[PDB]
Design an enzyme around this catalytic site. Structure first.
Site, PDB file in Angstrom:
ATOM      1  N   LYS A  44       8.115   5.912   2.383  1.00  0.00           N
ATOM      2  CA  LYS A  44       7.571   5.137   1.278  1.00  0.00           C
ATOM      3  C   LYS A  44       8.410   3.878   1.111  1.00  0.00           C
ATOM      4  O   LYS A  44       9.630   3.964   0.942  1.00  0.00           O
ATOM      5  CB  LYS A  44       7.581   5.950  -0.016  1.00  0.00           C
ATOM      6  CG  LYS A  44       6.994   7.345   0.116  1.00  0.00           C
ATOM      7  CD  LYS A  44       6.855   8.032  -1.239  1.00  0.00           C
ATOM      8  CE  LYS A  44       8.178   8.094  -1.989  1.00  0.00           C
ATOM      9  NZ  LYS A  44       9.264   8.693  -1.164  1.00  0.00           N
ATOM     10  N   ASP A 139       5.542  15.549 -15.298  1.00  0.00           N
ATOM     11  CA  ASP A 139       4.297  14.991 -14.770  1.00  0.00           C
ATOM     12  C   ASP A 139       3.746  15.888 -13.677  1.00  0.00           C
ATOM     13  O   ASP A 139       3.289  15.419 -12.629  1.00  0.00           O
ATOM     14  CB  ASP A 139       4.483  13.566 -14.251  1.00  0.00           C
ATOM     15  CG  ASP A 139       3.173  12.795 -14.178  1.00  0.00           C
ATOM     16  OD1 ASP A 139       2.200  13.161 -14.872  1.00  0.00           O
ATOM     17  OD2 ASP A 139       3.123  11.807 -13.412  1.00  0.00           O
TER      18      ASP A 139
END
Length: 346
Positions: A44, A139
């Protein structure tokens, strides 16, 4: 510098043969060949330094994932960045390559009860470790549960995580919140900042329901609609559970609502294992103090084929950090120092 789909993606001599995967939060994601370990990996690219909030979430996640070591939590294999703070405009995070995630899987695949059980076990096994470090993920949702072809599951995305702080959890009615709406516990809308472990258990209950039906159980369309969906299934909270809400605005909102009876789980999920629905009931309890804890969930009869506390490890010590008073310039220095261990000379 090698490039992919327009942008620079310079991951040095170790990683070659790039292939575009998609767009993450703060940049592009590619797969690449790890010329040292001879496996393909996920990389990433993160370009966060132009915004304080992006820098905070990036530092939070790096610090947590470098400290954690657990089979059901994604690791950081490598971090690539320029050798000086002046030249550092991006950071690349190298992680194990995972084929898919639970969000993509549920869009197209029915899960057998055996798969649901095994996935839930792995989620809770990872969460036990996280909570044992006094960390809240905050989350949890299907897109943050990565999967490979043999159904190994790893929790990812710790950008909203915090150290638990139950003594400072209380807040006013309709206080704004950042984490994903459909997986928010009812108390977030009523009187909670999301600083207690029960916030994550609610999200896991939502994920279990979604594995049973391939659709979200509480798909609220906006902030307060989320609570309407929850109460639409759980029914009106009891007098005892109301009396636990001292917040007058929140209490009086709940008292203003017409009485609603609980919808039975076996009518919402007629094909589900009855032990699965008993555990679901305990995760999706309105009152967070009565909600099941992660280690109790692991010991639930639904998971008895897997439960093994000696093989459900905990962290060697609690986590400790503030990142809300630091300007983006100082956050950049902290990210530079946190990533130094991956530079050649180290």
């Amino acid at each position: 510098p090698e490039m992919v789909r327009g942008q620079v993606f310079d991951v040095g001599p170790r990683y070659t043969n790039l292939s575009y995967i998609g767009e993450g939060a703060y940049g592009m994601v590619c797969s690449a060949y790890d010329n040292l370990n001879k496996v393909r990996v996920a990389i990433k690219k993160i370009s966060p330094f132009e915004h304080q909030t992006y820098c905070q979430r990036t530092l939070r996640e790096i610090k947590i994932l470098l400290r954690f070591r657990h089979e059901n939590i994604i690791g950081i294999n490598d971090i690539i960045r320029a050798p000086t703070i002046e030249q550092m405009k991006d950071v690349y995070i190298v992680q194990d390559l995972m084929e898919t995630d639970l969000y993509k899987l549920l869009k197209t695949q029915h899960l057998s009860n055996d798969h649901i059980c095994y996935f839930l076990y792995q989620i809770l096994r990872g969460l036990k470790y996280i909570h044992s470090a006094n960390v809240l993920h905050r989350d949890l949702k299907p897109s943050n549960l990565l999967l490979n072809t043999t159904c190994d599951l790893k929790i990812c995305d710790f950008g909203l995580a915090r150290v638990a702080d139950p003594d400072h959890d209380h807040t006013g009615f309709l206080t704004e919140y950042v984490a994903t709406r459909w997986y928010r516990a009812p108390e977030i809308m009523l009187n909670s900042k999301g600083y207690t472990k029960s916030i994550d258990i609610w999200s896991v209950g939502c994920i279990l329901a979604e594995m049973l039906s391939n659709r979200p159980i509480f798909p609220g369309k906006h902030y307060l609609d989320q609570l309407n969906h929850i109460l639409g299934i759980l029914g009106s909270p009891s007098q005892e559970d109301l009396n636990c809400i001292i917040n007058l605005k929140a209490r009086n909102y709940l008292l203003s609502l017409p009485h609603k009876n609980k919808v039975p789980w076996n009518r919402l999920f007629p094909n589900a294992d009855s032990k699965a629905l008993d555990l679901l009931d305990k995760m999706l309890t309105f009152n967070p103090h009565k909600r099941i804890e992660v280690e109790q969930a692991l010991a639930h009869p639904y998971l008895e084929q897997y439960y093994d506390p000696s093989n459900e490890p905990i962290a060697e010590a609690p986590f400790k950090f503030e990142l809300d008073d630091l300007p983006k310039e100082k956050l950049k220095e902290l990210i530079f120092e946190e990533t130094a261990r991956f530079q050649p000379g180290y």
